[PDB]
Nucleic acid binder design. Structure first.
Length: 910
RNA sequence: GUGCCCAUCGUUGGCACGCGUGCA
């Protein structure tokens, strides 16, 4: 209803007058050097609190007295700091000495919380409070009364007030907000951290610690965290059932036939178990992350030592323990200041704005208006100890285009264009008035010999509720991220009722950014690179590089062979049909594998990485597509360089500084590429948000307010999803997209963001699933018989296998395969046979009989999901048996179902 | 003002965006 948000334009300061610039710099340095004084002083006041002083409202959600008090006078400050004097050993008795308090679990687990002893350490804040009292020559009773009074006005402890009220009751304000900002933020973060840990520490079994260490022996059999997704929590039971069945088939072969042939028996037993676990991970890997075969075979090798239901407990115990032991506490560190400036209660100072800029340009020999901004900032000069309002220059061209241009009429190539383009507006008479208002909270920070002013501003929303329309999007890396907008109560072709209202499918399509080019119109979100029509030299250089390397060893069958200059994937990656970005991704994966094997000779693997990233004309850094597999290219590049460092020095662990010292250029390259990927993921977030909000505006001007149906992880205390799908979702910070989209929702009037978990959003048939009854129809892959392969027939016939389908997806694909047989009359006896050419011929005959020409068969890695209505807007009415379904696009139907998931609640009939 | 896209880097190339606490 009332949610204001900030917006800054990251302006740039210019040195215009050395004397005044240095005066402002001296004032800023004065305030910056005075800020640590207030930081230490407020630490001193905070540490002085004692029990019986919080005996007021006591309005905390679940924070006990012990935790609040300990955290408020126990903190982890940098090692090189005055408050030193305590060690992490005697913490319990130290707390006991203060007010005779018993350290309970609530406070103990805070105490029993690890920190980074390399740079931080615990500080007393109580003997330091006594030191402050002594240095102030004030009685302990007086200081205690003063701090109690301050806490009464919420001026110390948890959730302090703003510097305005503080200083009013207690130039000082701005340096104060750069001092107690950490004292206010880190305290709350730590208290919530301890709450979460206690809520996730007691829940740990505490009885399987023996089995936990037993399984942890796997690592001692770089270190990474173990999680339940490494086993397939609910399916390893069936895996061991099958392995037990095999063992019974091996007990007879072991007790009997003990001659010189049981060596082959044990070899085939090992092969059978390894291949069974591999098939187990692959089949479950089609819906989740494939468990590491190495871990599974290791644990099976210790099957006897662990019971059937003890492996699950051990792995979950390890997950909980190793996420608890890597989640650290928040150290209250010296905050760097920023010194915001505002026109309401901060240090008085103002951007002048356009009408006044025109006034001051007319009084001088300025043509009509200058390309820079002038800000009047109140600098308190020290030499002349007084405040003067001095004018300084900002150069934010974007700001000029946005709000800093008047309505007269209604290396520098790029930048100059923006002003000239904006200059043309002065003579085209198009730009509307901006209604300055002068409500900008300009921020001025001093790092070195420069400044980074921003000109922040506050924008209100007044969010609406009557969402006449809804919108959803996929935000996945499968392929073709997409969106779909659905109306609520329309009356037309689509009057499809869900429970009590006709949700009409308005539109649905892939969301791709438009980036016009001299001769084409590419899409950053899905370009996938060029089709290698002109990029022959780049791939040819890659071929020349990889021609001189013999081969590598795989792990599918524990053996591989080569003679000389054997290839790995060129025959299936050097095709002009393949996209450039995918080619680079595959090449980077191949190099990652090569270094994984060829580790000793890493000295020769630096020029190539440079070429793919810096030196190559079509380098990864230069040319890339802001495509879902594009982030895959950068992730594989990061992993490639990390593994290159880890396999060049092949043993204490090697840190970032070791990488610096070993090779300076490579480490700088990894940092540059990480920055590239960080700002590029920011770019994808903002661009997808911009398109979604623009299409939301389209709907708003068409019909009305539109929701977006995003995905949330925290702030709901549900977390019904496991860490498995949580990680499978949060990749490439998908939430960030949603996050960005809600931040922009804070300004684009009429929009509104609501997030819904990713559950029940995989194969649901839109508008019929959970409308009358659960449907959960499967996906397929429309295609002609002329381009089938072994995989398609293998997959469809595998769907026909009748067993205990633990995963509902397998059962639903079984039902889909039965429906496919009914539609085609495949004669399962003959359909489940070999010679896929026979199946293709039968499909061709069926298509010749029917009027249709392209066949339609179920599959997993396939698009063209079947819907019962017109969704894709290009769907054809294909009859399955007698159902006259619509062959829409799988991605669009996924966009449809990920939307409206909880519309029955997000859009109640209130 | 930072950035993103490009066989070629401009046709006056196209386009986007909040800077700073914890998010995998």
């Amino acid at each position: 209803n009332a949610s204001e948000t900030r917006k800054a334009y990251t302006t740039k300061m210019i040195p215009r007058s050395h004397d005044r610039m240095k005066l402002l710099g001296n004032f800023m340095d004065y305030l910056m050097d005075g800020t640590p004084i207030f930081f230490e002083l407020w630490n001193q006041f905070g540490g002085g609190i004692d029990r019986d002083i919080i005996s007021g409202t006591a309005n905390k959600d679940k924070i006990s007295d012990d935790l609040l008090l300990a955290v408020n006078w126990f903190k982890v400050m940098p090692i090189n700091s005055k408050p030193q004097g305590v060690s992490p050993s005697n913490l319990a008795n130290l707390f006991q000495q203060y007010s005779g308090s018993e350290p309970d679990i609530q406070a103990q687990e805070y105490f029993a919380s690890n920190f980074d002893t390399e740079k931080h350490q615990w500080k007393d804040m109580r003997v330091e409070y006594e030191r402050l009292l002594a240095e102030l020559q004030l009685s302990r009773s007086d200081m205690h009364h003063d701090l109690k009074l301050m806490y009464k006005e919420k001026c110390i402890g948890l959730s302090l007030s703003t510097a305005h009220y503080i200083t009013s009751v207690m130039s000082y304000s701005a340096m104060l907000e750069n001092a107690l900002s950490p004292i206010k933020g880190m305290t709350t973060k730590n208290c919530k951290f301890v709450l979460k840990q206690i809520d996730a520490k007691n829940d740990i079994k505490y009885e399987n610690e023996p089995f936990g260490k037993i399984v942890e022996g796997f690592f001692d059999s770089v270190k990474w965290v173990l999680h339940p997704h490494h086993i397939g929590e609910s399916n390893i039971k069936t895996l061991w059932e099958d392995l037990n069945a095999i063992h019974s088939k091996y007990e007879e072969d072991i007790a009997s036939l003990s001659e010189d042939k049981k060596e082959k028996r044990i070899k085939v037993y090992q092969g059978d178990v390894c291949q069974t676990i591999n098939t187990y991970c692959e089949e479950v890997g089609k819906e989740a992350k494939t468990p590491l075969v190495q871990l599974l075979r290791y644990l099976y090798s210790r099957k006897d030592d662990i019971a059937v239901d003890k492996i699950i407990d051990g792995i979950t115990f390890l997950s909980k323990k190793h996420k608890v032991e890597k989640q650290k506490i928040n150290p209250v560190i010296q905050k760097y200041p920023s010194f915001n400036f505002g026109n309401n209660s901060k240090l008085l100072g103002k951007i002048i704005s356009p009408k006044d800029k025109l006034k001051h340009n007319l009084k001088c020999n300025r043509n009509q208006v200058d390309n820079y901004i002038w800000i009047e900032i109140k600098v308190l000069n020290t030499k002349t100890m007084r405040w003067e309002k001095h004018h300084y220059a900002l150069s934010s061209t974007r700001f000029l285009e946005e709000v800093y241009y008047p309505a007269t009429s209604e290396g520098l190539r790029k930048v100059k264009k923006r002003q000239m383009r904006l200059e043309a507006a002065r003579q085209q008479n198009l730009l509307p008035r901006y209604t300055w208002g002068k409500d900008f909270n300009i921020n001025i920070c001093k790092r070195g010999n420069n400044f980074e002013v921003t000109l922040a501003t506050k924008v209100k929303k007044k969010k609406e509720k009557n969402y006449k329309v809804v919108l959803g999007y996929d935000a996945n890396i499968v392929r073709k991220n997409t969106y779909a907008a659905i109306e609520a109560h329309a009356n037309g072709d689509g009057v499809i009722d869900y429970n009590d209202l006709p949700v009409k499918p308005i539109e649905s399509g892939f969301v791709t950014v438009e980036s016009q080019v001299r001769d084409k119109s590419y899409d950053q979100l899905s370009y996938n690179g060029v089709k290698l029509l002109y990029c022959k030299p780049h791939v040819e250089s890659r071929r020349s590089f990889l021609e001189k390397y013999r081969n590598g060893t795989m792990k599918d069958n524990r053996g591989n062979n080569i003679q000389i200059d054997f290839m790995k994937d060129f025959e299936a990656i050097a095709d002009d049909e393949t996209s450039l970005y995918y080619f680079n991704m595959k090449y980077c994966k191949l190099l990652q594998s090569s270094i994984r094997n060829h580790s000793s000779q890493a000295k020769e693997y630096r020029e190539e990485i440079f070429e793919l990233l810096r030196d190559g004309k079509l380098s990864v850094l230069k040319l890339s597509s802001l495509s879902n597999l594009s982030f895959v290219m950068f992730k594989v590049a990061k992993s490639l360089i990390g593994t290159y460092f880890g396999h060049l020095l092949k043993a204490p662990p090697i840190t970032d500084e070791d990488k610096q010292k070993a090779d300076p250029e490579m480490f700088a390259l990894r940092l540059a590429l990480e920055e590239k990927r960080l700002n590029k993921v920011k770019s994808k977030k903002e661009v997808i948000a911009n398109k979604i909000v623009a299409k939301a505006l389209e709907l708003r001007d068409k019909y009305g307010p539109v929701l977006i149906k995003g995905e949330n992880i925290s702030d709901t205390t549900k977390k019904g999803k496991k860490s498995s799908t949580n990680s499978f979702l949060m990749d490439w910070l998908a939430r960030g997209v949603a996050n960005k989209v809600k931040e922009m929702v804070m300004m684009h009037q009429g929009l509104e963001f609501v997030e819904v978990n990713p559950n029940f959003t995989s194969h649901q048939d839109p508008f019929v699933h959970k409308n009358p009854e659960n449907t959960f129809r499967a996906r397929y892959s429309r295609c002609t018989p002329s381009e089938l392969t072994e995989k398609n027939r293998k997959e469809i016939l595998s769907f026909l296998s009748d067993k205990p389908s633990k995963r509902p997806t397998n059962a639903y694909y079984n039902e889909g395969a039965m429906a496919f047989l009914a539609t085609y009359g495949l004669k399962k006896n003959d359909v489940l046979g070999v010679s896929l050419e026979k199946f293709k011929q039968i499909m061709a005959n069926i298509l010749h009989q029917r009027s249709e020409d392209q066949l339609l068969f179920p599959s997993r890695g396939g698009m063209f999901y079947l819907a019962t209505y017109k969704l894709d807007a290009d769907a054809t009415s294909v009859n399955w048996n007698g159902k006259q379904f619509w062959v829409c696009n799988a991605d669009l139907v996924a966009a449809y179902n990920v939307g409206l998931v909880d519309i029955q609640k997000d859009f109640k009939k209130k």
